Write an enzyme that holds these catalytic residues in place. Structure first.
Site: not given
Lengths: 522, 461, 532, 524
Positions: A60, A390, A93-94
């Protein structure tokens, strides 16, 4: 000997204008490259070790950026966006960071031209609003449709979101566990209920989902091994009050003339504890848990009378338990009644990897479960936990919002086509900015294919050509190494993730580009 | 590391403002020094001496800087001084104020180049206007020349000695004209030597129709006073000299050594009678002189001076009209020192000097400055340099301009008219230049100490 | 595994090279175009040097990173070949490298990009030769003035551009030279440039002849000669040595005196042989002794010492005198011939800025041209002489190649769209490189506008629109145009405006830029070595 | 060499400044430094700024006062104008930008006159008389005396000016939300106190989704259940929710056996009785900042009572005002009259943040809160700062009245009128007043520079169109038309009081700084 008077402190750094802005853009790109490889079904994770020597691997991106303590100011905004998306929707988020950096990257050549940033940010805002509206239009529900089980969308959502992190080849398994688990969370919907238990050792294929509560904890007192450790159909008593001889109760001096009265005093103290224990037994329960420490003597009595007990249990797990067996935590032993007594289908405590755990499960009406997470790596514990977190939070969002979109970047390609076509309508400086918007936006498939080691130009070109006319949800397929209708391939991500991603990236570009100079103070 | 590893850089409006600040400071440190009301500035040199002078050029020349544009301005001042002498009392001030108004158009985001073009047009018009407002003047008429000199000097310490200064400058410059260029003869200001000797008073200083030599008679016998001397300039040394070609001698017979010893004696003699064949009176050389040749010349009653600086030799030659000679055997009566009205050697006090005065038509001359002490004398000679420089400028151009800022105001309203007829973006820079010009009279006013605003308004109106 | 230094590979080093190239670009990005603003360098010790010519900046700027050194050397070469475009070529190279990397930064294989670039350069030069404008029909002095004053902006002297162009064209036409028997080659650097602080360039004067930065040796010796008797002499003038080893040994003392006597009489007779010819002017790089000086004074001739060899060679070429390293003949006897003499109407030493310099006016044998600069400081004077040297260079290019290019960036204005259209022809991946070449090459108008500080995108778009219109309706005699300006911040016709540049500038510029891009792009790893 | 003289060794190492040189050059230069520092600041075309403090904390900002607060400055009169603008902000809101620009312009034009030799004192006289004349002429410029008390539309249109100024992208949303805030708050504790509005920052869910609650919020946990009643009964207690411990060191003592049993049992029983009595009045929710006894919360769970924790004194004060129920230092008396009343209270999740909500409907008036949503907390700081500045703007509006035409138009009229009065002044101060009038062109100038259009002819056209009395026409914001716009129709207004006060404070700062001639500086 006079001297000129300074304006600000000695060494107050200042840097104004186009060089400042382009430096910020380059810094954002640098941050991107630290995460560029990460996302992808064949994507990537990083290992970062702190100055303290504690290792930490992560896939993440937000976690990684948290570990990469950024000093440069502009990049701190990007890392904050990482925190925002992490708290909101999960992986991507990446993708969020990549979108932000690529927006800035495409804009920067025009920034070389002396364009007032506000025109750029206005174009950005307009484009983002239009993009969000387009996504919401092409959003897909299922409860209108016929061939959806109320969970199948959730199962496939977990399927999609998972298959980038460290457990990718066990997705068909973990999706079922997480969907069935979150189905129990109703209706509080908050993550604190279901704990995560990082048991050491074991293959993660053996990781356990229990329809109940377990403890990685206990503590050895005298008899704790003596009492029977099976209770087939037990009653759970939940004490917050400690059980010990005025150990940490009210502080009092006592005065006694008659020796016999002193005898009576010590007897009366022990009668306090015996009274509490009698209340406990006559309650009819057999299992007692306590936040506070347990007297050894009370343990002895439970052992003699075949009650199980335990002390010092962490409060969070106690709340889990009480919510599970339906009982209410008690602090007054006297007011006890059967109503507040939790019940469980069966109670146990069984070894897993040398550790002493406690089990009670099978409660038909239990809105909270827990993950026993086997795994041979301590680092797997944190990484799998992050991936699972997540998964849980994204599936929660999915339950909240019955909206799904295709994965594999197909959304981004559709937005690219739509925005590019729209750009033709608006003449002038806005047109170029919209074009750059689309050209930055297309990045997601490119990074996917690069981490897949393909000629993403052939993939991109075929993508655009096929995606002008032939169907909305065509996008990158990793294994077939070319386009596919990923929607039918069940690459399904909640719309909210991409929507929030685009909004955050847009305002990130606004913020960064809305800066001309920087002031530093020692 | 990319670029140079410890080379700084700075950019844009910051750089422009910094340079303007530097220029403004450069102007400011001198704004008090201009005008007949002027101040008097003195300097601490790096290596111990004391220098006091109004002249801006020297003031700045004793300034080292770190910011570059300041160094550029320094060089500008030194160039203007070299070319004209004064005006440096004003040039850098004008440049600084020019720049100061100039910067006001930078935050107008007005790009520099167009302003530059405006400046070029401004210069063209200013030159034209000044040429329109000149006055041609005779060059022969002496008292107008004296008036000009007095005008150009009544700003520095020599003001109270104006009569002497003007007479000195006129005399020196007038008598320096190498007419060998047909009717295009040129005067030169490196034959007008300046000599500073302490003691006495300014009033004692005077123009000597000749040259000054800070040397003495080599031997007692030579007469220190001669009416009509004849002068011979020996550039070569008068003594026996190294055989340049690393010669050597291998004698075998006894007499040979004494014979070669006699030979150099004989060579010295040869030179001596070669000189005396021309019936000279004075022997001058930049090199040494053999005491034996000194003997022979004494026997001929001929005065000899040794080891004088080459420039001094040239000036002496230009004084007595003779030409330098490096070969005694090739001496010609055409280079006999005819034209020396009097040869003399006085005592200034603890030191001999050489006086060669009353030339027929001397073309070279040195000025004898006799004052209080070397630093005041240096100030005096700097002022004299400026005066004689402007005098030569007049003898190159007979055109005159009314100063005192008057020409400046003429230029001001002329450019104002051109501007109000010259609509465009460049208009504002043009009138900005016009207004910037007004500050020379302004500075005059403050150095006077009067109501600057009301006086300037009355002037312009 | 190498000691004394690490290594970097792939993306890191690629980005590093682009980063350095962009740095170097931004170093000079502000000194190009008729609104270019010049640079200046506080050296380390105050000897500053104002200059806008890029190659000078790069040479005086120390550089350590390799690719930046490559660009610097490219700029130096360009200066050795054109004179300007160091205004431009560095920018072109950096921008092409930037966009080429941006392609590669994705994945694109470098050699494909290189091939695309090669094709781009060849296509571009061909299209330029289809875009050429010939000056032969045009008035000579007219276009010469145009090209000059076009180069003169972006410099200190652009304002006086008209006067300066007049002077430059006069000089260059006066330095005509008949080459290999079929070429009228014009030698640059043949015209002499002297700097002299003082008056303005307004008063800077052209010399119909040659000028010396020397002085009269002997003050008594005269100052002006209206006669043309000019002899050159490399052979120095001293009472001669024995010059190799020749020891002089005396066994009969009676002759030492006569020995010394001829030790000077040799020079005396040499001088007398020179003067009996009637030569009144002599020059000599070698030393001049006072012995000779006094003889000359008695003869009243003209003598100059320690003159630079190139200057006296130019003197021989102008006056028609013969360089003479010594006195000799086909027969052993040392003689001198009047035929060796060169001529010029009048030779004068004159005082400019209280420094006497020697002038030579109107050599009859071959007309010479020299230029004197007048200015405020040495900084402005030497930067303007650099400017003038560039001026003479570009005018030489114009004369040598009777061919001109419309200035103000019309070049890439056309090139971008033409290459854009040609790109689709290839059908491979390389047309992507072609398109990026065009878009990057579009940088020149961008820099022009930003240095002129107006909306650059709008000007560029209008330019592209005009050129694209010039690529529609092939009846372009009334639809083909060319032009771009800055002072009014809007397009024009530079052909009418007179904004012209020599073709070789852009041609060689693009070629060298392509080579630089090929060199630097092929990089994929540096390996460092800490020194011994 | 190496040894000049000092006729005064009075200082042990310090800076002596004198000779007007500092006033003529150095002080003016410092003021111009500040002027350049925040020239880009003001403007709808003004672009934001970021600064990190000495302690490395980010500050994205467009407001001038905030940015000046983060530059630790040393030249004294720099501090003069800084803190002058600071107090101005403390008085009106925006204008920090305005006043700093005024100060820069006035100082820069004054030093020119000082160089042209005008008396410093006479410069003072001229500036003062000019400022007073401008004050006199200002009221004659008021248009659109917006009077509507509690409508949303008028106030939204008005606050659009400040919001647009310090944030150009999102005028509509912020306008509507802040207007909803203003109308929701009535005069309850006196005339719409600025402190009556609270701001909460919640990351995620970008700015468009930010909302406003007619109640007030808490980012804290909960101890028992989570329930809302449409008739929610709230009890407040400054005292810690526990048996009242004597402040004196009171050690419980026993003498015989049964004391232990009876003492523990009685403690239990009387906590039970106390909380029961609380429940008897029907209060279902209790709040306190003091410590919570576990026994108490246990009994509360038994009686289905809500608990709220760790509140600071200001927080409980806010809640007191929200529910209008008096906080009770005595734990006992859940009195009916001073007992809470809220529409709804519950716990919700936003941005992975436990949130306590007091969702309300109050006719009598309540202190509402705005919820800020979006990614970057620094953007939260900027946006909430802008919102609070707008709230201040609305408050000042409410103070008296009288919007004035912004967009520089007012200031152009000021320039023209002051100049016209200038040629009727005559006296050497005429130059002073003329330069002061000239100084106001700085604002439209700044708008141009941040707008990037050629300022000079913009100002010229503005003058020309202002020669016909078009007091409502001002500087446009458009690259296509770098010419003009009529402010009144565009609604680009601003407050009378703000401009008046900014002008007066700028005048005061100028007259102060010009006045001082020589400086003395002890070593820091």
């Amino acid at each position: 000997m006079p001297t000129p008077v300074i304006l600000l402190k000695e060494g107050t750094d200042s840097s104004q204008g186009i060089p400042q802005l382009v430096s910020n853009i380059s810094a954002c790109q640098v941050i991107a490259e630290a995460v560029r490889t990460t996302l992808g079904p064949r994507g990537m994770d990083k290992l970062i070790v702190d100055g303290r020597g504690k290792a930490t691997i992560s896939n993440d991106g937000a976690t990684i950026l948290k570990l990469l303590d950024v000093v440069h100011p502009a990049a701190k905004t990007l890392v904050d966006i990482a925190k925002s998306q992490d708290a909101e929707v999960g992986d991507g988020t990446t993708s969020v960071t990549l979108l932000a950096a690529e927006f800035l990257k495409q804009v920067k050549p025009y920034v070389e031209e002396g364009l007032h940033p506000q025109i750029i940010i206005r174009a950005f805002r307009t484009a983002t609003q239009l993009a969000v509206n387009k996504i919401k239009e092409i959003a897909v529900t299922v409860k209108k449709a016929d061939k959806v089980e109320q969970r199948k969308l959730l199962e496939k959502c977990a399927m999609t979101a998972l298959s980038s992190k460290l457990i990718s080849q066990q997705k068909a398994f973990f999706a079922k566990m997480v969907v069935d688990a979150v189905m129990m969370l109703d209706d509080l919907l908050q993550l604190k209920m279901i704990g995560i238990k990082k048991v050491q050792g074991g293959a993660l294929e053996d990781s356990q989902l229990v329809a109940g509560v377990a403890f990685k904890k206990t503590f050895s007192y005298a008899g704790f091994e003596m009492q029977p450790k099976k209770y087939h159909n037990p009653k759970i008593a939940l004490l917050n009050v400690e059980l010990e001889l005025k150990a940490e109760k009210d502080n009092a001096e006592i005065r006694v003339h008659t020796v016999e009265d002193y005898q009576a005093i010590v007897d009366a103290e022990w009668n306090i504890l015996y009274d509490k224990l009698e209340k406990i037994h006559h309650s009819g329960a057999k299992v007692v848990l306590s936040k506070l420490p347990i007297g050894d003597v009370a343990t002895q009595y439970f052992a003699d009378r075949d009650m199980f007990c335990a002390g010092r249990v962490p409060e969070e797990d106690l709340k889990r338990t009480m919510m599970a067996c339906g009982g209410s935590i008690q602090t007054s032993v006297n007011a006890l009644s059967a109503d507040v007594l939790g019940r469980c289908q069966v109670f146990e405590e069984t070894q897993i990897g040398g550790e002493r755990y406690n089990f009670f499960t099978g409660c038909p009406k239990a809105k909270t479960c827990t993950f026993i997470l086997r795994g041979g790596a301590e680092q797997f514990m944190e990484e799998t936990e992050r991936s699972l977190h997540d998964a849980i939070m994204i599936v929660r969002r999915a339950i909240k919002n019955d909206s799904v979109v295709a994965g594999g970047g197909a959304i981004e390609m559709e937005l690219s086509k739509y925005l590019r076509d729209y750009s033709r309508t608006i003449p002038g400086k806005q047109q170029l900015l919209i074009g750059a918007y689309a050209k930055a936006l297309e990045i997601i498939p490119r990074q996917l294919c690069d981490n897949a080691g393909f000629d993403a130009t052939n993939i991109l070109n075929k993508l655009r050509a096929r995606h002008a006319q032939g169907g909305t949800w065509y996008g990158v397929d990793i294994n077939n190494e070319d386009i596919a209708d990923n929607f039918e391939a069940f690459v399904w991500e909640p719309a909210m993730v991409r929507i929030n991603a685009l909004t955050a990236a847009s305002e990130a570009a606004c913020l960064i580009v809305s800066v001309d100079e920087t002031i530093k103070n020692p | 590391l990319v670029l140079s590893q410890n080379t700084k850089r700075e950019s844009g409006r910051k750089v422009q403002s910094g340079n303007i600040n530097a220029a403004k400071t450069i102007a400011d440190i001198i704004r008090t020094c201009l005008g007949p009301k002027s101040m008097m500035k003195m300097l601490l040199d790096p290596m111990g001496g004391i220098v006091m002078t109004n002249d801006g050029n020297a003031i700045l020349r004793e300034i080292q800087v770190q910011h570059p544009a300041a160094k550029s301005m320094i060089e500008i001042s030194r160039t203007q001084d070299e070319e004209v002498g004064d005006g440096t009392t004003s040039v850098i001030i004008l440049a600084g104020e020019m720049l100061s108004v100039a910067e006001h158009f930078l935050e107008q985001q007005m790009h520099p180049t167009v302003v530059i073009s405006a400046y070029r047009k401004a210069l063209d018009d200013m030159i034209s206007t000044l040429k329109k407002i000149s006055i041609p003047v005779d060059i022969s008429d002496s008292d107008m020349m004296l008036n000009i000199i007095n005008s150009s000097i009544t700003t520095k310490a020599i003001s109270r000695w104006s009569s002497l200064a003007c007479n000195i400058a006129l005399d020196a410059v007038k008598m320096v004209q190498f007419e060998e260029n047909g009717r295009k003869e040129i005067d030169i200001k490196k034959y007008a030597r300046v000599e500073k000797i302490p003691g006495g008073i300014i009033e004692d200083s005077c123009v000597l129709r000749g040259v000054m030599i800070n040397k003495d008679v080599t031997h007692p016998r030579m007469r220190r006073y001669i009416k009509n001397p004849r002068i011979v300039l020996l550039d070569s040394s008068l003594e026996y000299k190294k055989g340049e070609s690393q010669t050597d001698i291998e004698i075998t017979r006894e007499e040979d050594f004494t014979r070669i010893l006699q030979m150099e004696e004989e060579y010295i003699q040869q030179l001596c009678e070669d000189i005396i064949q021309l019936k000279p009176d004075v022997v001058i050389t930049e090199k040494g002189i053999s005491d034996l040749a000194q003997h022979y010349l004494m026997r001929a009653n001929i005065t000899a001076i040794r080891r004088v600086r080459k420039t001094d030799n040239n000036r002496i030659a230009r004084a007595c009209g003779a030409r330098i000679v490096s070969r005694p055997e090739e001496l010609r009566e055409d280079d006999v020192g005819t034209g020396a009205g009097l040869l003399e050697i006085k005592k200034i006090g603890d030191e001999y000097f050489t006086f060669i005065t009353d030339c027929k038509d001397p073309k070279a001359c040195t000025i004898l400055l006799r004052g209080a002490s070397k630093e005041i004398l240096s100030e005096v000679e700097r002022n004299l340099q400026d005066a004689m420089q402007v005098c030569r400028n007049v003898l190159l151009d007979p055109q005159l301009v009314p100063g005192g800022g008057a020409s400046e105001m003429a230029v001001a309203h002329a450019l104002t008219e051109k501007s109000k007829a010259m609509t465009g973006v460049e208009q504002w820079p043009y009138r900005a230049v016009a207004q910037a010009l007004e500050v020379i009279p302004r500075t005059l006013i403050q150095n006077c100490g009067a109501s600057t605003i009301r006086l300037l308004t009355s002037l312009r109106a | 595994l190498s000691v004394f230094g690490d290594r970097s590979t792939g993306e890191t080093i690629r980005s590093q090279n682009v980063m350095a190239a962009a740095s170097i670009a931004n170093i000079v990005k502000s000194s190009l175009g008729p609104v270019g603003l010049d640079k200046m360098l506080v050296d380390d010790i105050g000897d500053v040097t104002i200059t806008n010519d890029g190659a000078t900046i790069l040479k005086l700027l120390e550089v350590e990173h390799p690719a930046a050194k490559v660009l610097c050397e490219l700029a130096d070469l360009q200066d050795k070949e054109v004179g300007d475009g160091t205004t431009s070529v560095v920018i072109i190279a950096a921008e092409l490298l930037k966009n080429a990397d941006e392609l590669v930064k994705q994945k694109i294989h470098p050699t494909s990009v290189i091939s695309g670039y090669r094709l781009a350069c060849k296509e571009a030069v061909r299209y330029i030769n289809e875009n050429l404008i010939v000056n032969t029909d045009e008035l000579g002095r007219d276009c010469l003035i145009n090209a000059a004053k076009t180069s003169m902006s972006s410099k200190i002297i652009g304002i006086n551009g008209d006067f300066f162009a007049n002077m430059v064209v006069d000089a260059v036409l006066a330095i005509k030279y008949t080459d290999i028997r079929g070429q009228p080659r014009y030698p640059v650097n043949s015209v002499n440039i002297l700097k002299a602080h003082g008056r303005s360039q307004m008063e800077s004067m052209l010399i119909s002849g040659y000028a010396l930065n020397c002085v009269v040796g002997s003050q008594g010796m005269p100052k002006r000669i209206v006669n043309a008797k000019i002899a050159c002499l490399d052979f120095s003038l001293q009472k001669t040595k024995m010059k190799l080893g020749v020891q002089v040994v005396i066994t009969d003392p009676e002759k030492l005196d006569q020995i010394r006597q001829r030790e000077s009489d040799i020079t005396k007779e040499r001088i007398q042989k020179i003067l009996a010819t009637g030569a009144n002017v002599i020059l000599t790089t070698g030393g001049i002794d006072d012995m000779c000086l006094k003889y000359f004074v008695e003869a009243g001739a003209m003598a100059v010492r320690r003159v630079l060899k190139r200057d006296l060679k130019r003197i021989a070429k102008a006056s028609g005198a013969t360089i003479l390293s010594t006195l000799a003949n086909l027969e052993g006897e040392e003689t001198f011939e009047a035929a060796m003499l060169g001529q010029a109407e009048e030779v004068v030493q004159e005082r400019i800025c209280d420094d006497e310099l020697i002038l030579i006016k109107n050599t009859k044998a071959r007309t010479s041209a020299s230029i004197i600069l007048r200015g405020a400081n040495d900084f402005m004077c030497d930067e303007m002489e650099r400017s003038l040297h560039d001026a003479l260079c570009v005018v030489k290019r114009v004369l040598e190649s009777k061919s001109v290019v419309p200035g103000g960036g019309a070049v890439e204005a056309a090139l971008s769209i033409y290459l854009e259209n040609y790109a689709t022809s290839m059908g491979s991946r390389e047309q992507l490189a072609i398109a990026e070449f065009a878009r990057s090459l579009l940088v020149i108008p961008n820099t022009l506008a930003v240095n002129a500080a107006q909306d650059s995108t709008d000007l560029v778009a209008k330019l592209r629109a005009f050129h694209n219109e010039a690529q529609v309706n092939p009846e372009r005699k009334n639809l083909k145009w060319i032009g771009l300006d800055l002072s009014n911040g809007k397009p024009r016709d530079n052909k009418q405006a007179g904004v012209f540049e020599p073709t070789i500038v852009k041609v060689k510029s693009l070629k060298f830029a392509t080579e630089a891009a090929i060199t630097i792009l092929r990089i994929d790893d540096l390996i460092k070595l800490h020194p011994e | 060499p190496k040894a000049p003289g000092f006729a005064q060794m009075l200082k042990e190492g310090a800076k002596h400044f004198s000779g007007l040189e500092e006033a003529v050059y150095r002080n003016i230069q410092a003021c111009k430094e500040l002027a350049q520092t925040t020239r880009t600041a003001y403007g709808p075309n003004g672009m934001n700024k970021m600064v990190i403090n000495h302690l490395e904390k980010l500050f994205v900002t467009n407001d001038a006062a905030t940015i000046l607060r983060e530059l630790e400055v040393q030249h004294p009169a720099a501090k003069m104008i800084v803190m002058a603008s600071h107090m101005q902000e403390q008085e009106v809101g925006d204008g920090t930008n305005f006043v700093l620009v005024f100060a820069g312009a006035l100082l820069e034009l004054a030093e020119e006159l000082l160089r042209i030799g005008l008396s410093v004192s006479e410069v003072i006289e001229g500036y003062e008389i000019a400022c007073r004349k401008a004050h006199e002429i200002l009221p004659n410029l008021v248009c659109c005396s917006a009077k509507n008390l509690r409508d949303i539309d008028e106030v939204s249109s008005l606050l659009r000016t400040s919001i647009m100024s310090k944030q150009y992208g999102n005028e509509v949303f912020l306008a509507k939300l802040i207007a909803q805030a203003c109308v929701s708050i009535f005069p309850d504790s006196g005339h719409f106190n600025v402190d009556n509005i609270r701001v909460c920052k919640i990351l995620g869910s970008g700015i468009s989704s930010s909302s406003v609650l007619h109640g007030m919020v808490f980012k804290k946990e909960t101890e028992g259940d989570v329930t809302s009643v449409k008739d929610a009964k709230i009890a407040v207690y400054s005292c810690p929710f526990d048996g009242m411990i004597t402040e004196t060191k009171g050690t419980v003592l026993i003498k015989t056996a049964e004391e232990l049993m009876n003492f523990s049992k009685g403690e239990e029983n009387l906590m039970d009785a106390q909380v029961k009595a609380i429940a008897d009045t029907g209060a279902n929710v209790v709040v306190t900042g003091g410590k919570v006894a576990d026994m108490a919360l246990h009994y509360a769970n038994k009686y289905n009572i809500m608990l709220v924790r760790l509140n600071s004194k200001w927080d409980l004060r806010r809640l007191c005002k929200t529910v209008g129920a008096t906080a009770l230092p005595r734990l006992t008396p859940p009195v009916l009259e001073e007992m809470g009343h809220c529409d709804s209270v519950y716990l919700s999740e936003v941005g992975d943040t436990q949130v306590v909500v007091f969702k309300h409907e109050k006719e009598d008036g309540a202190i509402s809160t705005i919820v800020l949503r979006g990614s970057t907390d620094n953007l939260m700081d900027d946006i909430e700062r802008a919102v609070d500045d707008g709230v201040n703007t609305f408050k000042v509006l409410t103070r008296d009245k009288r919007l004035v035409p912004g967009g520089g138009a007012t200031e152009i009229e000021l320039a023209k009128q002051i100049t016209s009065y200038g040629e009727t002044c005559p006296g050497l101060e005429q130059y002073a007043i003329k330069k002061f009038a000239e100084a106001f062109e700085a604002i439209p100038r700044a708008l141009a520079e941040n707008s990037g259009v050629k300022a000079n002819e913009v100002i010229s056209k503005l003058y020309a169109v202002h020669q016909e009395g078009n007091k409502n026409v001002g500087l446009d914001i458009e690259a296509e038309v770098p010419a003009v716009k009529d402010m009144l129709e565009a609604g680009i207004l601003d407050t009378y009081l703000g401009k008046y006060w900014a002008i007066k404070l700028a005048t005061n700062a100028a007259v102060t700084v010009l006045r001082v001639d020589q400086i003395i500086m002890a070593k820091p």
